[PDB]
Structures are given as structure tokens and as C-alpha cells.
Design a binder for this molecule. Structure first.
Ligand SMILES: Nc1nc2c(ncn2[C@@H]2O[C@H](COP(=O)(O)OP(=O)(O)NP(=O)(O)O)[C@@H](O)[C@H]2O)c(=O)[nH]1
Lengths: 974, 184
């Protein structure tokens, strides 16, 4: 207003009367301060010249000196001892200008601290005059202080020395003084129509306003305390009206606070004045006026700052890169303001700082939530619009609580110990619960799929909001967002549909977008398998994302997801079978269809792995620990495990039918190769007939291992092994009477065992045997391959049975046998035969012994030895020694025996069974096992070979001796 | 198997669908049962193709029956509607001992027709506990009236003796077969 002019004039009347040489902190030059004041006041120089003319015409104030003289010490003692009380004569030469302070006894110096003005006219022409005269209780003279006033300024306390007047005493002491200079009652109307203190406050307000508007175009980073020339022009009109620093300090505080409430400057510049009220308040007093103004400005700055920290989401947002610093500075001038005695003057506010700060935080959070709700489009009625509004609102509240957790939490807790996050999260879970609960109430019990998805996003956002609780020291008792999952109970059947309708979507497109080709040459499946892995992982991820804390319903959802996954398994199986059918209607290649069935069954195997991973993916182990309490035994294995096992069995079907198809093809090949192998002539060696079957089996199974997973290949190997064992067993009976193809089949079984074992395309059947394998190999090894081998096997079995025979009724012949390793001669001593039977039906025993080495073809060139004949002897005495010329090589061979036609071991004879040469011939007694009419299965297989005559002679004489021994056989009593 | 059918023995509490599925799966019966918590899951590998090729016994087609014993408590009725999504055939069981199970049959059908798998739900209404004649407060005429009004077949099976449960489930499986031969 008009005061901006009149205050301006007062500035001139206080600045062209500036007298004295410049201070270390004050400057004496009119032109620079005048041009700076014109620049700050935005006043054009013609008005400046007009005001200078109007201030020259005002009469000049009569200048005076505020002579503040203090005590004097250091004066040498030439007076009476003690009672030294000199008096000071203040005067200025260029009552009226002289004064004599009264003297006080029993003092080194009088201490009174009073000041009387001394009117003068000129500063550069006048000298200071002050003399001491120490009266004695002679009045001895002391020194004086004489200095030119040009170096005399305001704020000039110093210790000045008294100049000696006579040279008889060199020292006069040092006296403390305080030099000021003030004006008298001045003539301006600006400072006399209004009180000097309020025009000082207004003038200082003018400088601080123009300083903060001239330091920058705006005001946000003004750093100084004041401009230097502005500080000087402040320093005059602060001490030239008899004014101390006390009213200047309160005026500085009032101007700075009202300026801050007018326009923003950084409040660290408020830190310099506020501590001044901390420093100087107790020693001084104020009247009933301006003390209430001090209290009102305290209350107004407090209210402005509290309205600032109530709205700290707007005035200090985290986008201007110094919001926590500026906020901390605002609280740091809010503390150190309540931290003096001067806050005892606040009648509008007595309740303390942390409680009212929390009150402002509470109101600001509530109002911010309300304005955010109005921001998030509530003006359109409807349920999906309100749903998306709530989703945006809870996302914004998640953001606000996140930025209240990292940044704004510590700066509220370190200074005044206020937990922002706990109270903010309590309030903004209550105000959000009361919105989502009503939204889900007006949802009803019917839920649309898009509406269900909206509630699902709201569910996970609110679950994040409740997750933020556990990082805030367990907010309990104020629970209003706990059990928020209850309100989403009507939305559960939609989600478990939609998730399924998501998952069934993917597996519908996965088979649609895939031609079922092998995924590279390092793994064996297609993209449908990895899509299964991702889709079932998505199902399990949805199940984990839900994480229903209620037990029985969580069990119910887990059963729902298990049936969804099993149903998707069956669905996917039907789609790949249909896709294989669709492709087989496209092409007609045998190899393409074969490898298509292959990649289908590796996809099924991959799905089996995924289904096996489902108890780990859906976490049934963590389920059964909480749903095993109120449920029944076996129910967990029935509802969860049993349908999974049925899904695995339904995978086994068309795993064990896709494998079974290839197994049927390969078993047809193996069986036809075996049937064409037995059809070859018997005059060929058994090493070139195996080649076609062997190369076919090798190349087909050894292409097919690279095309199939090892587990399905192991199943295919086991089925093929079982089938070829069955084929070889049924082909082991359709053989000719000579049975010389039995060695071909033995070579076949050996190579088929060794081709199922070769690594890379054969898996070792050495731990998994079946009774068919050993039965076939033993039965056909006894079938193969010559007549002499069968005779040797019969003799080995017969001597094993004879060693197992201990009955003495059939006859016991006592012989001695010695084999020599140095003379080559076998020595046999036959003594006697005991406990015999008659060799004639009349009752006459005929013990006569043919000591033969048998089998006869094993000893082709030797003359057998014989004993003397005996008639009717139950204990005949032979006691004959006979030598036999036979080397040890045929004797150590299997089946070699010494037969006594009336056996005994020949490879186990003493002297050849691992012992030394017998110096004394041991006993050997064996009971005679007569040939039996009930023969072993070996004889009818000798009788198939009729070309040779020796084997036929053997079997005919064996039958004759068997029927003859049956006549002499004594039937046992029942 | 050759077909896989998902029965839901669904009804009220105290009706005893657990005993019905127990007496269909085997011959064992319990005097007292606890209320079903969550849902159960019975399995049966019959070979019927609807019912046996000699009329009631023989080799038809292998039917793997899942027989879900759903809960009758109201706490597991809302979420159980997710299992109605592919639920071929429903076993409405009520008890002739109490009439509240009878009046809740209409509400049960009204809930089922909005959650049916195919174009129309399959229902066989079984008035269980028909051997205990001391507390029978449900007449045959009213039951056959509700059957003919809603078009659903009806039976008077019981689990304490095991009679007629098998025939009821067999003809319901037959009804599902007529519906599949109707759907294609
Ligand atoms: N005498 C008799 N008792 C029966 C018959 N059927 C069931 N009950 C009895 O009635 C009760 C039925 O138990 P239950 O199957 O759990 O009934 P529910 O609770 O309605 N079914 P859920 O267990 O699924 O909740 C048991 O006491 C059973 O013994 C019946 O035909 N005759």
C-alpha cells in the first residue's frame, strides 16, 4: 500500500545520516546502497531524487553519543592504600556536556552501569574527552582517553588504555568501555506517527521480502542470512533509537515467520533467528503488547507447519528430490521451537508435539484416502467401474505404504519417536476393508468370470497389503483386514473355473499350435511337454498365490485342483491321440506314423513326470499336516492320492499301448525271424543264421532308443524280452528228432541275451530274470547238441543220483581205485559185493563183473578187464587187481566213469580229485542204481537220432537191462 | 477302462450318502458315521456299459465310476458347486425319516439345473433308510408325485440292508448312457 512509500522515506532519513569510517562488518558508501535499495524497491530514479529532495528539507537530527562507560582497573598504586574511587568526566569538544558519577568506597572501581547522552555535531572534527581524578580519603591525577570519533562506531566495547599526562608515572591502567552513537528525537513522520518498534518490524519485513524475491526469481534455495548492504541498513534504525538487540531479535523472528507464512523460503534460514529466542528470552521482558504478538506468531507458524505436515503427500512429494530433507528441516524448526521456555507462552496450544503431529498425520491420511477415492473415478455408477476403482485405489495405497516404509518412517521416528507406518497401515486397512467388504456384499453370491478375475486381482492386492503387516511389529487387536478371504468365498468357484478355463485354454492351443515334432536332438518330447510344465506350474502357482488359511476349504480347493490336473491329463491325452489321427489322415508313411507314436508316448511320459511332481508342486506334504486333524484315515490317500494313481494308470494305458503297438510290430519281426531261422537247412554252421535277426533287432531297437525316453525304452525292452522268450519257448518244441538245431537255438538265446545287454541300445537283463529264461536255457542246453553230449549228461546225472543213493538193498560192491600221475595206470582192486539180489528169477545170484570205462565212445581203443564168474553168492570174493591204460585227460572230463557190469567216480577218483598219488589205495563203496523202465526225458531224445548206431545200441541195451532188472526188482512192502 | 463317469452323491446332512456309497462299493456298513468333512472320493471298476448284458450281470464296457460323497453341511455347499462343472449324474439322497430332507429336494434340483454339465441334469431320487419302518414319515405317493412332477426316476433303497442301492445306481448309469446317445 502507501506505507511502501512512507517506509521508503524513513530509510533515507536513516541512511544519509550514516557517519563514520566503515566497520569490518558495515560499509560506508551511499551510492551503492542507494542503487541496491532502488533495485530492490522497484523504484525508478526520478522518484528516488524526489524523495532525496523531500528528505533534505527535513531538519537534521541533533547527534549524540551513548556514552556507556564501565569499570577501570590496572591503575598503579600511588594513592592511599585502598579506597581508590576515581570519578569520570565525560565530555565532547569540537548538566550540559559534563557529568560526575558519585564515588563508592571500599571498591577498586565503582560498578553502576548507567549511560547519559552527550550531544555533539561533527564526528571527524571532534575528539573524545574523558579523564580520571582519584580522590583520596590530595586527589592524585590519573590518565585520560582521547581518540578521534571517526573510528568510533556502534557496538564498540573494548578495553582502552588511559594516556599518561605526566612522565613521572608511565602506566595509568586499562579501562573497559562501550562506545555507541544514537540519534535524538528525530523529525520524520514515518517513525513518529507510528511506534519505532513496529516501524522497525515493518522495515525489516520489507528488506527480508525484497531479499528473498531478489536472490532468485522464485524462492526455494535462498541460502544466506541477509544481504551485506541490507544487513548494514538493518543495523542502522536498530541502535540509533536507544534499542538493544532484544527487540531487534524478536522483530527478526516475527518478520521471518510472517514471511514464511507469506511465501516459502527454506526453513534452515529460520534456524538462525529461532535459537536467538532460545538465547535471549530470560534476561529481558516485554510489555503486554507484542508479547501476545510473539505468542500469536508462535501459534501461527505452528499451525502453518502442521497444515504442511498434515498434507505431506502434496507439499513434500517424493519427486522434487529434497522432500525428506525439507520435511526434516521443517520438523527441526518444529523441534528447537517447543524446546525453549518461550513455548510456555502458548495458550492456544498446550498439548504436546508428538501427539498433535500424529493427529495431523491421521487427518492427512484420512483426507488423502478420500481425495484418492474421488480421483479414482467414482462418479459413474456400476459394479465393474467400482471394482477397477478399488483396484487402482489399493495399488495407490500399496505405493503410499511402501514409500512410508522406506523413506518417511525413519525421519519421523528418530526425532520425535512417531511410528508413521503402523498407524497409517491401521487406518488404511480400515478404510479399505470398509470399501471392499461393501463391494463384495453388493457383488452377491453370483460372480461373473470377468468379475471373478477382478476380485482375484483385488484378493492378491489385499493379500500384499496384509503381507505388509508382518514388517511392522505384529499389529494385533486392531484387526479389520484379517479374514478378508471370507468375503471372497462366493468368488472361489469362479476362480477355480477360470484357472481351469485358463489351463484348458493353454492345452487346447498347445496341441493346436504343435505338429508334435521332437524338440531338438538332446531331449525327446515336443513343445506340448514344456507347455505342460509351464501350465501345471501355473496351476500350482495359482494354488500357492491363493494360499487359503482356512483348513477344510483349502483341502477342498486342493482336491479341486488335483481333479482339474487329472482331467487335463485325460483331456490332453485325447487331444494328442486325435492329433495323431489327424496327421495320419494327412500322410501315409510307416516311419512317420511310427515316430509320431514315439513322440506321443514321450509326451505321455513327460506328463507322467509332471503328475509325479504334482504332490511337490501342490505341496500335499504341507497340506496333510493341517487337514489330517478333523478328517478320517485313508481319506487323504483316497481324495488326493487315489485319483492321481488312477491318472497314472490311465497314462499307463496308451503308454503300455503305444509301446505295445511298437512291441507288437517288433515281436512279429522277431517271431518271423525265428521261424525263418529254424527253416534253414541243418547242414550250415550256427554262426551265419543269426545274422539277419540280429541285425534287424539291433538296428530297429537301436534307432528306437534315440527316439524314445529311457524309461519307456526300458518298458519296451521288458515287453520285447518277455515276448521273445515266449516265442523261443514255443519254437523250442517244433524241432526235428535229431535236435541238432538246439545248438542253433542256444546260440540264439546267448546272442539275444548279449544284444539286450550292449550299452547304448540294450539294457542289462542281469538283475531282472524270469523263470521262463532259466527254464528255457536249461531245457534246451539239455537238448543240445549231439548224442555223446546227452550220454555224458545222463552219466553225470546218474552218478549224482547214485551219490544221493544210500540204500543197500540194490547191491553194494567194494572196490579200490587209485589213479597215478607218474605211471598213467589206473589200478582197480575189486574185493567183494555185499547185500545183493539174485540175478536169476529162480533165486541164484550170478555176480560176474565187466570192469569197463564208460561211455564207450570216450574210450574207443582199450580192452576191458573181467573177473571170474560166481554162482549163488550173497558175498562173493573177487579180490583181483587190474591195471588200465588211460590218460588223465579223458578221465578228468565230465561224464567219465568206471562201470561195473554185474558206476564209481573217475574224475573224482583218489589221486586225481586234487590230492596226491595214493600210496595206499582207499575204499570206495557205491550202491548200484539199476536201469529203470521209467526213464529220464533224455532217452527219447537220443532215440531221435537213428543215423548213428552207437547211441541206438546204447539205448536198446539200456532198455533191455531196464526190463531185465525190473524182473529182479523186489517190490517193497506197503 | 472304456468310460469314466463322475457320480455325485449329494444331499443334506444326516441323510447318509457316505453309507450309500459304502454299501455300493462293498458290503460293509457302519451303525454310526461322523459327518463328511470336505468331500470324499469312491472308486468302482464296474463292467456294465449301462448295466449287465444279460440284464443285470455280465461283461459290457468297463465303467470307472468316481463316486464323490459331497458334504451336506452348508459350509461346503458354495465351493462344491465347482465340482458340478463336469458331474455327469447326481444322486439326490433324502431320508424317509425326516421331512426337511424331502422339502429340500426341490431346492436341491433348483441348484442343480443351473450347474449341470450337459443341457439337463441327471437325477435319481433315492428314499434311503426304507427298512426302518418305525420312523418313516414320508409316503410313497408324495415321493412319486415329486418324481413325476420333475420327471426324475425314484427308488426306495436302503444302506442298513444293502437292498436296491445297486439297481438305483445301475439305472442312473443307464440314464447317463441314454443321455450320451441323446447328445450325439
Ligand atoms: N437303518 C438305516 N440306517 C441308515 C441307512 N442309511 C444310512 N443310515 C445311517 O444314517 C447315517 C448316515 O451317515 P452319513 O452317510 O454320514 O450321512 P450324511 O452326513 O448325511 N452324509 P455325509 O457324511 O456325506 O455328510 C449313519 O448312521 C448310517 O448308519 C439305512 O438305509 N438304514
Amino acid at each position: 500500500p502507501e506505507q511502501r512509500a512512507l517506509l521508503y522515506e524513513d530509510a533515507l532519513y536513516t541512511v544519509l545520516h550514516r557517519l563514520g569510517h566503515p566497520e569490518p562488518n558495515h560499509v560506508t558508501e551511499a551510492s551503492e546502497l542507494l542503487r541496491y535499495l532502488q533495485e530492490a524497491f522497484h523504484v525508478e530514479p526520478e522518484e528516488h531524487q524526489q524523495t532525496l529532495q523531500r528528505v533534505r528539507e527535513l531538519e537534521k537530527p541533533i547527534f549524540c553519543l551513548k556514552a556507556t562507560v564501565k569499570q577501570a582497573k590496572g591503575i598503579l598504586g600511588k594513592d592511599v592504600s585502598g579506597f581508590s574511587d576515581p570519578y569520570c568526566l565525560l565530555g565532547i569538544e569540537q548538566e550540559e556536556e559534563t557529568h560526575r558519577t558519585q564515588v563508592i568506597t571500599q571498591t577498586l572501581n565503582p560498578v553502576w552501569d548507567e549511560t547519559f547522552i552527550l550531544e555533539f555535531e561533527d564526528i571527524t572534527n571532534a575528539s573524545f574527552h574523558l579523564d580520571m581524578w582519584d580522590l583520596d580519603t590530595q586527589d592524585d591525577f590519573l590518565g585520560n582517553v582521547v581518540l578521534r570519533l571517526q573510528d568510533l562506531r556502534c557496538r564498540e566495547d573494548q578495553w582502552y588504555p588511559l594516556e599518561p599526562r605526566t612522565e613521572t608515572y608511565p602506566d595509568r591502567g586499562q579501562c573497559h568501555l562501550q562506545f555507541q552513537l544514537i540519534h535524538k528525537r528525530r523529525a520524520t513522520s514515518a517513525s513518529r506517527s507510528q511506534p519505532s518498534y513496529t516501524v522497525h518490524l515493518h522495515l525489516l519485513q520489507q528488506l527480508v521480502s525484497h531479499e528473498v524475491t531478489q536472490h532468485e526469481a522464485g524462492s526455494t534455495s535462498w541460502d544466506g542470512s541477509l544481504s551485506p548492504q541490507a544487513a548494514t541498513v538493518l543495523f542502522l534504525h536498530a541502535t540509533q533509537k536507544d534499542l538493544s538487540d532484544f527487540h531487534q531479535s524478536m522483530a527478526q523472528w516475527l518478520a521471518y515467520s510472517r514471511l514464511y507464512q507469506s511465501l516459502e523460503f527454506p526453513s534452515s534460514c529460520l534456524l538462525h533467528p529461532i535459537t536467538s529466542i532460545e538465547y535471549q528470552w530470560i534476561q529481558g521482558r516485554l510489555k503486554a503488547e507484542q508479547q501476545e504478538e510473539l505468542a500469536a506468531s508462535f501459534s501461527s507458524l505452528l499451525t502453518y507447519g502442521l497444515s504442511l505436515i498434515r498434507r505431506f503427500r502434496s507439499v513434500f512429494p517424493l519427486s522434487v528430490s529434497d522432500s525428506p530433507a525439507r520435511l526434516q528441516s521443517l520438523l527441526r524448526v518444529l523441534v528447537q521451537m517447543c524446546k525453549m521456555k518461550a513455548f510456555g507462552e502458548l495458550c492456544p496450544n498446550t498439548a504436546p508435539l508428538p501427539q498433535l503431529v500424529t493427529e495431523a498425520l491421521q487427518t492427512g491420511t484420512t483426507e488423502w484416502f478420500h481425495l484418492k477415492q474421488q480421483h479414482h473415478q467414482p462418479m459413474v455408477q456400476g459394479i465393474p467401474e467400482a471394482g477397477k476403482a478399488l483396484l487402482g485405489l489399493v495399488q495407490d495405497v500399496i505405493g503410499d505404504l511402501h514409500q512410508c516404509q522406506r523413506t518417511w518412517d525413519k525421519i519421523f521416528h528418530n526425532t520425535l519417536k512417531i511410528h508413521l507406518f503402523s498407524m497409517a497401515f491401521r487406518e488404511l486397512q480400515w478404510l479399505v476393508a470398509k470399501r471392499v467388504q461393501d463391494h463384495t456384499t453388493v457383488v452377491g453370491d453370483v460372480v461373473s468370470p470377468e468379475m471373478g478375475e477382478s476380485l482375484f486381482q483385488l484378493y492378491i492386492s489385499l493379500k500384499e497389503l496384509c503381507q505388509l503387516r508382518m514388517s511392522s511389529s505384529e499389529r494385533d487387536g486392531v484387526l479389520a483386514l484379517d479374514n478378508f478371504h471370507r468375503w471372497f468365498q462366493p468368488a472361489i468357484p469362479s476362480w477355480l473355473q477360470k484357472t481351469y478355463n485358463e489351463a484348458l485354454a493353454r492345452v487346447q492351443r498347445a496341441v493346436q499350435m504343435d505338429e508334435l515334432v521332437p524338440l531338438g536332438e538332446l531331449t525327446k518330447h515336443s513343445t506340448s511337454a514344456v507347455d505342460l510344465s509351464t501350465c501345471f506350474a501355473q496351476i500350482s502357482h495359482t494354488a500357492r498365490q491363493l494360499d487359503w488359511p482356512d483348513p477344510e476349504e483349502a483341502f477342498m480347493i486342493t482336491v479341486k485342483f488335483v481333479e482339474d490336473t487329472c482331467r487335463l491329463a485325460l483331456v490332453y491325452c485325447s487331444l494328442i491321440k486325435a492329433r495323431a489321427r489327424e496327421l495320419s489322415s494327412g500322410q501315409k508313411d510307416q516311419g512317420q506314423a511310427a515316430n509320431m507314436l514315439c513322440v506321443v508316448v514321450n509326451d505321455m511320459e513327460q506328463l507322467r513326470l509332471v503328475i509325479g511332481k504334482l504332490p511337490a508342486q501342490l505341496a500335499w506334504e504341507a497340506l496333510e499336516q493341517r487337514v489330517g486333524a478333523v478328517l478320517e484315515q485313508g481319506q487323504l490317500q483316497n481324495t488326493l492320492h487315489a485319483q492321481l494313481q488312477s491318472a497314472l494308470a490311465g497314462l499307463g494305458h496308451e503308454i503300455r499301448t503305444g509301446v505295445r503297438t511298437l512291441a507288437e510290430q517288433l515281436e512279429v519281426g522277431i517271431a518271423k525271424h525265428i521261424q525263418k531261422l529254424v527253416g534253414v537247412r541243418e547242414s550250415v554252421l550256427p554262426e551265419d543264421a543269426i545274422l539277419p535277426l540280429m541285425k534287424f533287432l539291433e538296428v530297429e531297437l537301436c534307432y528306437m532308443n534315440t527316439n524314445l525316453v529311457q524309461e519307456n525304452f526300458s518298458s519296451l525292452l521288458t515287453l520285447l524280452w518277455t515276448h521273445t522268450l515266449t516265442v523261443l519257448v514255443e519254437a523250442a518244441a517244433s524241432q526235428r528228432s535229431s535236435s541238432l538245431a538246439s545248438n542253433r537255438l542256444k546260440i540264439a538265446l546267448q546272442n539275444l541275451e548279449i544284444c539286450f545287454h550292449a550299452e547304448g541300445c540294450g539294457l542289462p537283463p542281469k538283475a531282472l530274470h524270469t523263470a521262463t529264461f532259466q527254464a528255457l536255457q536249461r531245457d534246451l542246453e539239455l537238448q543240445a547238441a549231439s548224442s555223446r553230449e546227452l550220454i555224458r549228461k545222463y552219466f553225470c546225472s546218474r552218478i549224482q543220483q547214485q551219490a544221493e543213493t544210500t540204500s543197500e538193498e540194490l547191491g553194494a560192491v567194494t572196490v579200490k581205485a587209485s589213479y597215478r600221475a607218474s605211471e598213467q595206470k589206473l589200478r582197480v582192486e575189486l574185493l567183494s559185493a555185499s547185500s545183493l539180489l539174485p540175478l536169476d528169477s529162480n533165486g541164484s545170484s550170478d555176480p560176474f563183473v565187466q570192469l569197463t570205462l564208460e561211455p564207450r565212445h570216450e574210450f574207443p581203443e582199450l580192452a576191458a578187464r573181467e573177473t571170474q564168474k560166481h554162482k549163488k553168492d550173497l558175498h562173493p570174493l573177487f579180490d583181483e587187481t587190474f591195471e588200465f591204460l588211460v590218460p588223465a585227460e579223458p578221465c578228468r572230463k565230465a561224464g567219465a566213469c568206471l562201470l561195473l557190469t554185474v558206476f564209481l567216480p573217475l574224475r573224482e577218483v583218489p589221486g586225481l580229485s586234487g590230492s596226491e598219488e595214493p600210496g595206499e589205495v582207499p575204499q570206495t563203496r557205491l550202491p548200484l542204481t539199476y536201469p529203470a523202465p521209467n526213464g529220464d526225458p533224455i532217452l527219447q531224445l537220443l532215440e531221435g537220432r537213428k543215423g548213428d548206431r552207437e547211441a541206438q545200441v546204447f539205448v536198446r541195451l539200456r532198455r533191455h537191462r531196464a526190463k531185465q532188472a525190473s524182473q529182479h526188482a523186489l517190490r517193497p512192502a506197503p | 477302462y472304456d468310460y469314466l463317469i463322475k457320480f455325485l452323491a449329494l444331499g443334506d446332512s444326516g441323510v447318509g450318502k457316505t453309507s450309500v456309497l459304502y454299501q455300493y462299493t462293498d458290503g460293509k456298513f457302519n451303525s454310526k458315521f461322523i459327518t463328511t468333512v470336505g468331500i470324499d472320493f469312491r472308486e468302482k471298476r464296474v463292467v456294465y456299459r449301462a448295466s449287465g448284458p444279460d440284464g443285470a450281470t455280465g461283461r459290457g464296457q468297463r465303467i470307472h465310476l468316481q463316486l464323490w460323497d459331497t458334504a451336506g453341511q452348508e459350509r461346503f455347499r458354495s465351493l462344491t458347486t465347482a465340482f458340478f462343472r463336469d458331474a455327469m449324474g447326481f444322486l439326490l439322497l433324502f431320508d424317509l425319516t425326516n421331512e426337511q430332507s424331502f422339502l429340500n429336494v426341490r431346492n436341491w434340483i433348483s441348484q442343480l439345473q443351473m450347474h449341470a454339465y450337459c443341457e439337463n441334469p441327471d437325477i435319481v431320487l433315492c428314499g434311503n433308510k426304507s427298512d426302518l419302518e418305525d420312523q418313516r414319515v414320508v409316503k410313497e405317493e408324495e415321493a412319486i408325485a415329486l418324481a413325476e412332477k420333475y420327471g426324475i426316476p425314484y427308488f426306495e433303497t436302503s444302506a442298513a440292508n444293502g437292498t436296491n442301492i445297486s439297481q438305483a445306481i445301475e439305472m442312473l448309469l443307464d440314464l447317463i448312457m441314454k443321455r450320451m446317445e441323446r447328445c450325439v
